Each structure stands twice: as structure tokens, then as C-alpha cells.
Design a protein around this ligand. Sequence first.
Ligand SMILES: *Cc1c(COP(=O)(O)O)cnc(C)c1O
Ligand SMILES: *Cc1c(COP(=O)(O)O)cnc(C)c1O
Ligand SMILES: [Mg+2]
Lengths: 769, 756
Amino acid sequence: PFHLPLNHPTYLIWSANTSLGKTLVSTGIAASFLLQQPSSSATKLLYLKPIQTGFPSDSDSRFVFSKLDSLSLRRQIPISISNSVLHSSLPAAKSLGLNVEVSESGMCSLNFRDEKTVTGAPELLCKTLYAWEAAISPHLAAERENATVEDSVVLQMIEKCLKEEMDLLCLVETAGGVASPGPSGTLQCDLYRPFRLPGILVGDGRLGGISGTIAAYESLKLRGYDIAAVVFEDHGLVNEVPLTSYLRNKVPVLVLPPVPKDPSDDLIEWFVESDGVFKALKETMVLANLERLERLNGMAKLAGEVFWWPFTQHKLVHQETVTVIDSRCGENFSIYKASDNSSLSQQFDACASWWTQGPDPTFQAELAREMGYTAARFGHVMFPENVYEPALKCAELLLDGVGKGWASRVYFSDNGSTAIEIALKMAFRKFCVDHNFIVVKVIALRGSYHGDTLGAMEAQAPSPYTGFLQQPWYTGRGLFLDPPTVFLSNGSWNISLPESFSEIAPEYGTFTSRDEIFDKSRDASTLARIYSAYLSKHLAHVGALIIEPVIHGAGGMHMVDPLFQRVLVNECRNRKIPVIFDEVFTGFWRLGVETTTELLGCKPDIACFAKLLTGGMVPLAVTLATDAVFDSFSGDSKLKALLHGHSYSAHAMGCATAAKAIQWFKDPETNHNITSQGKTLRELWDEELVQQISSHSAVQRVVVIGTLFALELKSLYAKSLLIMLREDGIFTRPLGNVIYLMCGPCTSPEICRRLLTKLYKRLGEFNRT
Amino acid sequence: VSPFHLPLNHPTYLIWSANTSLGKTLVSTGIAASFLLQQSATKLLYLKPIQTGFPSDSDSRFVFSKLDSLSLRRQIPISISNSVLHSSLPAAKSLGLGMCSLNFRDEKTVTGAPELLCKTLYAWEAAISPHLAAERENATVEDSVVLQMIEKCLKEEMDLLCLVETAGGVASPGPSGTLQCDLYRPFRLPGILVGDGRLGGISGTIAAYESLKLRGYDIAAVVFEDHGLVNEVPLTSYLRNKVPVLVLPPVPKDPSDDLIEWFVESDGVFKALKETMVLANLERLERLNGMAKLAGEVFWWPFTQHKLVHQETVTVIDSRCGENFSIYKASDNSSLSQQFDACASWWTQGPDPTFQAELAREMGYTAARFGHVMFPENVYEPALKCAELLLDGVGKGWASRVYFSDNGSTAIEIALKMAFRKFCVDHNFIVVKVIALRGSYHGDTLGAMEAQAPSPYTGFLQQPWYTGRGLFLDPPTVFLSNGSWNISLPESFSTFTSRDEIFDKSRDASTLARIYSAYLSKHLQAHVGALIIEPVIHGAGGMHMVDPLFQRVLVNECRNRKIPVIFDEVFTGFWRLGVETTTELLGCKPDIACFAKLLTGGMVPLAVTLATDAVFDSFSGDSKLKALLHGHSYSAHAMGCATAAKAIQWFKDPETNHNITSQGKTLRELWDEELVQQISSHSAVQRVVVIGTLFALELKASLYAKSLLIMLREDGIFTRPLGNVIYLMCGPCTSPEICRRLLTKLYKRLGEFNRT
Ligand SMILES: *Cc1c(COP(=O)(O)O)cnc(C)c1O
Ligand SMILES: *Cc1c(COP(=O)(O)O)cnc(C)c1O
Ligand SMILES: [Mg+2]
């Protein structure tokens, strides 16, 4: 996780294309910042050129260093100046005549500095981080010169330099255009994204420059960057008018006077003539940062005054614990802490933002482009009796995948809770059609959860959460059975039977592996027969079975014995009771599979999906049904149809995003966790760390499967772990004594390993064992 | 203000470019030559809508002339023509003849041979970008005029392939100043992108491609001139190989070169380009012609009896641009045509074509910056901004809290939880029920349903668990008929010149006022723990206007008895009725209010329940079990928040919504007064309700209504039935002129039942 100080402004200098005067602009800003009269000892300009090709003939570090030297003399204001090149290809080093040693990556480390100090004066500090010799775009230079630098290495160097230096202003000058490939091949705009630094855009004042400037600006916006200003060289075409117009005058557009064409010109008098514009640029950049922090420093207090957060007792919430989230990039929030030293730092989103979370940084950026396109093409268009490409594509993908082998209809709605209410209407018709047309109720497992609208609530068993104070109209309309659960403890997997159960011999009740728990061999066991009897015993009329397959999420991340659910499902189907799988939580790879029908070994009549359905970008819900359930609403009367609808039913925005995620999560080319056969994710959670955590004395049980790692503490332990993890850069949310880490379908195991290591070390702080 | 018709039977493509001087005209010519010079039916239509630097520069002439040469070179005769239809005066003076019309043609026919047909539609002389040329030469052409000429040309000519070559870059201003990519958007033609093979060209090609994608265009291919930098590798990689990238060989640098051998050498690439364009069109139509049949097999539409739905009436919607769907009709002659979305896509609809494009960039940014991030106990810019704008606007003078949820129906359930706590806290902690107006509607989830009165639509067959938990009163309604406005009182009970007089507080001193309070007071004194209303208009119930006086009296009685008041503004909110909130119309404020639909300017779901400090307080405690424990996983999704913050400002700002004034509290009248009177006085019309963006009429009964629906559809107007009620619903920014056309068409159809 990165740490970025936010106390002093730091800006990316972007450009529409090469040869627009990017370096001239940096130099200009620097000169206006350093060569102020109210001369302060405190004043320092940090200039970073991370990537530089054409070295040493070209060097934008040297250019800035050298030009400010001249402007210092010209303006009669002394300054301290330095220029450094930290790394360069072998070819590049051989030019300087250094003959340094090559490293693993093909890069040499240099001791090439050049100082000209003046004590007490304002300080200019120029660094080039990596340099290549060929005067060509970085990706090409890298391969020809056999010298690479990985993306995160570049970002780490930048981070390192920033931390060391931090009145103060830092300029990070990019290489080539907004969307030019860096050394690794990554587009520059993607390379810098994890930092999401604010920037300025050097536009193009030539003919064709309005388009090139707008396109570049937009590509930036489309990755989440903010641009405080556009500046360009005047060529007499008045480009700034359409530009200002397009920007709705929300971002200043500054015009530099023409640059001397004579190749032998010192440029000094141009800089002097351009001073007004650079002054405006500097001021704009400084004020935008000021204004940006003013907002951040106020956000938490203001949130507590104006929001009414869901599921949260406001009286217990204090300003100090409201988290300020400035952005996300894949699995990581960037969070602002004034406490720190004003800074933005990464934090892993281990609650997966209410179990929605899913995209990689690469996927997030892809989705953003898919969504902008969908807004522009479709906005929202009326669903009933209509068809449009994204809703249809989404239905095909659902039916051919998660719906394969049972479903033939897709009914759209807005979220899990609406999908469920629909599912209950669906189940009850089918039930009534199959039993000659009278009070109906559900059969469910106590602990299961199905959303917070009234209908969804009724399928939930009575509890402190459903009393009169929460919903006066709740009546608990169900037969609720207590489920066998299963968990890891001290190296092995166990069954835990409810009181109502027989009491089984210790021989049964223990398993070698998680796999056995799910092995259909178990249909032949005494436990199955006991399960069957138990259910036959218990089975107003039961008109629907509703279950959370495998995991009861909201109920505390318990694993329900899959055998028991499979037996329950069969019994209900035998008695013509429609079966609903509430897969809102489990769907789309949460548990390592596309649908838990692969885990339970049986298929439903009706099923609900949401959360990960749209890869965590936006709400959309879906209820799949069998032909037979559909038929039970077929008739001549509109009164007979299923009359539930929401205005945004099947919104193109959500459909497009889901179609995109459903394919991306499942494709071995985009999801490297997807296994050779395409039905399952590889194990994401370090096997040894999981055993160790399962064996710790503070830990009552562990449930681990696909993207979910959960433990229940034997609670002060639980309050404390939450705080401790948060100090480790891990953000999660309490579930009573249950603590959990939830990654996305594409998260790398290496990341997961780090999460478990941190968690385990914190456990050792309660007791060594 | 007319709807376009675009034949889809033959491929038509925009030729886009990253920048000037990349060889856009070379590419057109190349495609054309490959298409025409195949070894009678074949015709290539080449359109250059905008041209500057004329006559020294003329891409028409270039194509015409190069095709002539390639015909000779390849020994295959063709018919060729070149025409320039309009040009500024300066330009015409050059030829020796603010826009002038020209006859300037140049034919060389060969009977029976394949036909090349080149047209320049508008020309300027100055060799500079179009927006500049236009002002210097005092020669303008409006955006819709350009599109109409293009439409005209396409219809007249329509084996066949059409190329429309743009001017300058993807985002260069056209003559009027509109960016080229916005100018052509209403047509949403597929295109190809001429990229840049020079240094710096990977970036500029990606940037240009993205700006296109970011407006809803599809790009079948990228092609560029090779400069030896191997630009096509990063490009292919960026495009995940979903779109071919073709590389033309280097173009002769010598200024005196024919180019004929270059075209010959480049034939492979141009055939691939041609094939790509033709196949993409073929496959596109194959999908369209299949969509309706497939929808009926796979979808389960909401609120729709599938058995009564037939393939022929499933609408295929290829895109929207502001108020207009583009719909595909195979019946027609394969074609995309505009249709006004007059049901406002379930009363969500709002954006202008300008606003839609703006919202699309705001949304991509929000996806890229935030995705979805956890709401509870957190804060992020878009959710917070949205809350401020809500509280400072729609919530001004009463609300202090914003509670996010996913749609109208969830907002309502939350509102009901809110209301009941406050009620119980104020009455020492027992069955509770709602008081409501029969006919009102509040969403389809169970809790929302309970606030709705028993009806065929809440029986056992729809929701077995519905019990009707309310005291439901019959509301006085109000409507226009034969020139004047009337009250209609319910059995249980028993003329204004202008709609204005109905909303006047003076009616508080009136007669009905006291009758109302009598009635209400009696019925009021299981417990009534909440008042819930659809202010002003009962939407789903038939677009009835409820007497605002009656609602205001009901609200005051309930507040007097300490019964919390909920305004369900999910329909009425955000300018649906000409005001930001109906609190402006009713003259009283609620304790709790729900918003959705237009809240996000029709792009995407998001809902909100606003509350007073006092309601909030009734959940303050030391126990988490006392908090309000309703939540949805996507609560306050940044996508929806950002969008709403954007729309709330845009709809209200006289700069972006020309229907708004700067007094800034109300929209100007959008519906032609005379046409409204006429329609209100037609013999087939029982009543009219007109206000803000809503025009509704109820037919006497019904055959006329099933009929009007079909008739309007033939007139390019898409709406949806509400029993005998027929309605037109525009967005907050729709121009009156457009509305007038809607009324004209509706009135004309009425005249087909009876003259009067
Ligand atoms: C989250 C969830 C729901 C409800 O979905 P929302 O979109 O949050 O309302 C329903 N069922 C299960 C199992 C869930 O996890
Ligand atoms: C549409 C509507 C609702 C429900 O909104 P959805 O988002 O469609 O659930 C609630 N109240 C009124 C008055 C509405 O029009
Ligand atoms: Mg050209």
C-alpha cells in the first residue's frame, strides 16, 4: 500500500502530443515558483522526470536545471539548483562514459549529480529516475536497449522521492502523450493511476489541436484524474475559444505567446514575456490544492451532520472514525487522514464494500469505459415489451451460465431485496397452480438473510432485528429450521448439529477435508437419513423453500452442511414445493464457482442474483426462473401476469456492466485465478496460514472458500482486531465476533497471503499460541 | 423538429481521423476503389459534408479523379460524378460564380458500369478549420441542416456502399462550432478510424478512439500509414484484438507522385478494410433481425402478460439520443428511425442530447475514480455533494438528513419505518397503519404495497402476503374540460379559469376548505401512525390531479394529531411538474420525503429519503438495535450520487435548462395553450391534466385509446397505456416547440375519431 503526503501540491504535467512544449511549461512554472521576491529559504521546487528517452542528447532535467540557472541570473535572484540521473540503460551510460554495472533488469545505477548550491536561497531539485538512449517512445527503447523497469518500481521510486522531500511544489513530468506506452508497455495514463495525482494538460495550439486536446483531456477524465488547467502555445488559430466553451469555463485555459522559431534562441526573453501566464498557472495549481484540502478536512464533520447512514447508530459514531474515501483503484481505497500528516494512503477493502466488490485495477478501468459508452448510447430506455443489446446479452450470458441446465427466463429488478420479493411471488403462484389455487408461508433455515424490504424480511426468522422497533409490520411468515453447520478448527473440518439433532457419534461429524463435506458420496450416509427424517417430521401451508446456499452471509459467515441443504431441496421438490436459491451473496465467484449449484449438486426452480453480478460498479438484480414457473403466469388476463416492476427495470447501464463482468470473471485471459477447465477458481488463501489461524487459541472456527476468509473469535478480541487491521491498511467491518476478509474474483493469492500474515501476527498479540 | 429516417439496407460509414494530415481522403479513395473495381448494380456514394480550402482543396475532386485513374490502370470502366451543392461567396467567386447554391457538376458516364458518385455538401474557401472559416467568410450552416442534407442524400440513393468523410479531427469544431463527434451523434453511424503511424500517434489514436466510444459510436476498424515505428502492436494490444488494425505502406514523399502504384500496392489493405466494413454491417443486421424473437424467448418483462405479446410488437431500440429512441424496423425497409419517448421510459426521462453526452463523461469518470465504495460511516465526494444539493434544494426549510437506497420502492419502505418510530416515540411506544388517498401508488415491494388500497392489482394472485394496512380516503380530483378547470368530489362528499387559481392559498379561506377539515377530522379521530401522499398528481393511478387544497388540509390535520407526514415525490420530484419539489405547489412541508426517478436525470437508479432532525432523533441511542436497520449493498453508490448531483444542478440552472428562468423556481409553460384548450374540448376527451412536463387526457369510455396508441406510434411517438388515459411526458429541458409538435399530432389523430 502507498503513502502519499498531501501537505504540499504535487502535479502531473500531461501533454496532448509530443512537441507541444511540456518541458517549457514545467520550466515556466518552476521559475515563477522559485524566483518570487518575498524570497523564502523555505521555498523548494521538486522536478521529477520519471521516464526519459533520447538521453543524454535530450534531458528535460538538464533543461530545467539549466534554464532556471539563467532565469536566476536574468532576474537577479540567487537559487540553489541540482540535477540527478538515478538510473539509465547501458547504452545511455556508455554515452556518459561511465561504464557502470548492469543490473538484473538491464538498468544501470548512476552517481551522476550536478550541484550549484547557494545557502539560504530557494531550492531547485531536478531528478531523472530512468533514462534510455534511443530517441524513441519508451516501450521501443526498452526492448531495443534491453532495459526495463516495472510499473510498480517506477511508482515506488516516485513515492520514495516524494516522502524524502516532504513553500514546496512538486512537478512530475510525463513522457510523450497522455496515452503513450511507458517502458513496460502500460499506457502512461494507466501507469500513474494508483496515485491519482491532479494534473495540468499541455494542449495543442496548432491546427487540429482542438480535437487532440479535447481527446487527451477526455482520456484523462475517463480514468479518474482531475485537471486544474489547460495551457498551450498560441499559433494564431484562437484554439482557446472552443476549448473554453467545451470546458464550460470550469477549468482555465491559458495561452502562451508564440515560441521563437530560430533554433539558436536562448528563450530567456520568451520566459520573461510569458511570466504572466506562468504566474496564473502556478496560482491556479496552488489554489486548486488548497481548495482540495479544505474540502477533505471538512468532509467527515459534514458527513456526520447531513447523512443518515444505513444500519448505523449515529450516536455511537464520532468524527474521528468517519473514513474519508477519495477514490478506489481495484481492491484499494485511497483514504485521506488529516491526523497522519495530511496524506492519502491505500487500504485493502476487505469487507468488499458490503460484499459487492470485484474488480482489479485493470478491470475497473475497462468497466469505466464500458459504462461511459453505455450512458452515451442508451442512457436508460424503457424495458417492458422492448429489447436492447445490453439487456439481451446479459440474459443470454445468465441463461447459458449460472442458469445452465434449469433456467429459461430472466426477470430484472433493482437489487437483492427486490429480486427476492419477485422470487416469492414466483414461487407462490407455481405452488398454488400445482395445488388447486388460504395462507402461505416459507420454509427456511434460521440465520439465512434475504434483504431488508418487508417481503424479504418475512423469509427471515424472528430475532432482535425483526422486532416491532425495526418493522411493525413484520410477522415472520415461515417455518424456520436450525441448520447443521460446518467449519475448520485445529486443522480439520467438523459438523455442528443443532440441539434438535439426535446427537451423533464422534466417528461421524469429523472430516479429513473440505472436499469430503461436498462429496455426493455423503448421500449414502446415516446423517442423510437423519436429515431426511428430521425434515419429513417438520414438513397455513409451506408454499416455498428459500435458502442461502452453502454460506449464510449476514448471519455470520457460517458454512451450512451442503448435504443438509441438498436433502432439504430434494424433500421439497418431492412435495411439489418450489425451490428458491438466494445466490445474491454466493453468485459469480464469491465462493470460487459461478453458481453454487455446482457446490450443492442440485438445481433450483427459482434463483436470485445481484452484488457481484455487476462486478461491484452499480446495482442490478436478476431473478431466473424455470419454464414451468413462467407458465404459471401465462394467460389471457393482464391480471394474471406477474405485476411487479420498477422504473429502472433492466437499466442498460447495469445490464451492460453485468454482461461485461460475467464474461471477464470467467475468462482465463482476464481472470488469472480461473482454472484450466473454467468452472472453479484456484485456492486463493495460503494453506499454512489458514491452518495456523484455525489453530490459534482465540479462534473458535474458520470458514474459508473462494474469495472468503472468515474466523469467529471465542467480544473484545473482535473490537480490537478491527482497529488493529485498520492500522495495517486493512479495512473490514464487524459481524459480531466474526471477522472476515473478502477479496474479489481476480485478486492474486500473493495479496491474500499478505492479508493472512497481517491477521495472524495481530492474533499473536493476544496470545503467542 | 422532425424525426430522422435512415435506411439500413446498405452500409454507411463515417470516416473519422485522429488528426489532420493522416490520409483520410487516401483511405476513402482506397475503399472506394476496392469496392468499385471488382471483376451494374454496384454504386459507391461518397459524401464530404464539410470542406474548407475550396476550391484549391477538394476531397470530392480527389476521389473522383483518383478513381478515374485507377479505372484506367485496372482496365475496368466506371461511371463517375462530382458535385458541390453549396459554398460561401468567397469560394463561389473563386470558381467564377451566407451560403450560395451551386449547379457545379462534372459527369463522365459509362452505361451499365459500376457507379461512383461524389458530393460535397458545404464548402468554404479559407484553408482553415470550419468554425473559423464560417465566421470570416460570413457563411453558416446549422447542425440540423447538415444532417438533413445527409439524410436527403442517403434516402435518394437508397451492391451499395456509402462513405461520409468528416472534416479534421474527431473532436474538431464544425462550422457551427459544435464538435464534429457531437454533430453526427443523432445518426450514430458506425465508423472507421484513420490513426496515426508517426511518433506520438499511439496516444493520439487511442485518445481519438476513446472520445468516439465515449459518445456511443462503434468503430469497425483502425487503419494508418506505416512510419516504421510499429504502432500497430500497442494499438492491437489496447484493443484486445476486438477491432482490426490495418497498416498502409509508406506514402510517397515526392510531391509530384501519381499515387497510382501506391494504391495498387495498398490494395490488400483496402480490400481487408472494405471486407471488414461490409461484414460488420451484415453481422449487425443479423443481430437486429433476431433481437425481437429472442427477447420474447428469454426475457420475463415486468408488468406484462407475455401471452398477449407478439414478435411484431416488441420494439427494437438501438440507442437513444435525448428524448428520441432510435428504433429498428425490418418491416420498413430495414431502417432506424427516431421516436419520441413520450412515456419518458417509465417516468424516469430527462436529458437533452447535450445533457446525455455530458452525463456520460461524468459517469465514466465516476466509474474510473470510485467504482462502488462502501457507504456506512464513510464519506466520498459524490455522495456528500448529492446530499448537500438535496438538503439545500428539495429539502430546504425542513429536512436535515439524507438516507440513500436503491429505488422509489425501497425509499418508501424506509420512509415508513421512519414515520412509525417518530409516531411511537411521540405516543409512548400495538398495531399501526397508514392513512392514504385511494389511488395513490408507492412502489411494488411488500411494505410499499401495504400503503396502497385494495384493488384487482393487490389480490391474492399478485401478492399473497398483502393485507392492506391503511385507512384509505377517496380524494377530490381536479381537471381541465371544455376550457375551464373543475373539481370532482367523491360520493362521500357533495370552476376556475386557470390552473394557477387551484394552487392559490386564498382557497384556504374558501368553502371547501372547511368541508374538507370536517370530513378529515371525523375520519381521523389499530392506530394511524403515518400520512403518506403522492402530492398533486397520482401517477400510476391514472394521472389524476388531486385538489391541492385537500392535501394541504389533510397534512395539517395529521400534523396537528402528531402523525408524521410522508411526501412520496418519487414521481413529482425534480421538475416533472414544473417545480423542484411540490412543496412549492402544496404550500406545506413534510416530515419525510422520498425521491427517485428524475433524481438521477434518467440515467441509472438511486433513491433518497429525506428526514427532519426530529425523525432522525427518534433513532438516536446507545443500542445499535435502536438504529434504523435497513440497508442495501449498493447504498449511495458513487455512480448514482455523481449522476444525481450533476442533474440536480443542470436541471435548475438557467444556463443549461432553457425552460428555467432565473427566478429559478419554476419552468415556463411547455404545452401549447391553444392546442391544450382544443384537445380539452374534443368530444372524445373526458378530461385533461396538464402541468410542467406532463400532458395527459382521459378518453370517454376503450377503442379510442388502444387506437390512439397505435396511431401515435405511426407518428413517431412512443407512449404506454394507462387504461383510458393517454399521456405525453417530456423532460425538464425539452423545448416547447417539440411539445407543440406532439400536441399537433395528437389533436390530428383525435380528429380521425370525430371532427369535433
Ligand atoms: C445482500 C443480500 C441480499 C440483498 O441485496 P441488496 O442489494 O443488498 O438489497 C439478499 N440476499 C442475500 C443472501 C444477500 O447477501
Ligand atoms: C415509480 C414510483 C415509485 C417507485 O419507484 P421505483 O424506483 O419504480 O420502485 C414510488 N412512488 C411513486 C409515486 C412512483 O411513481
Ligand atoms: Mg482528408
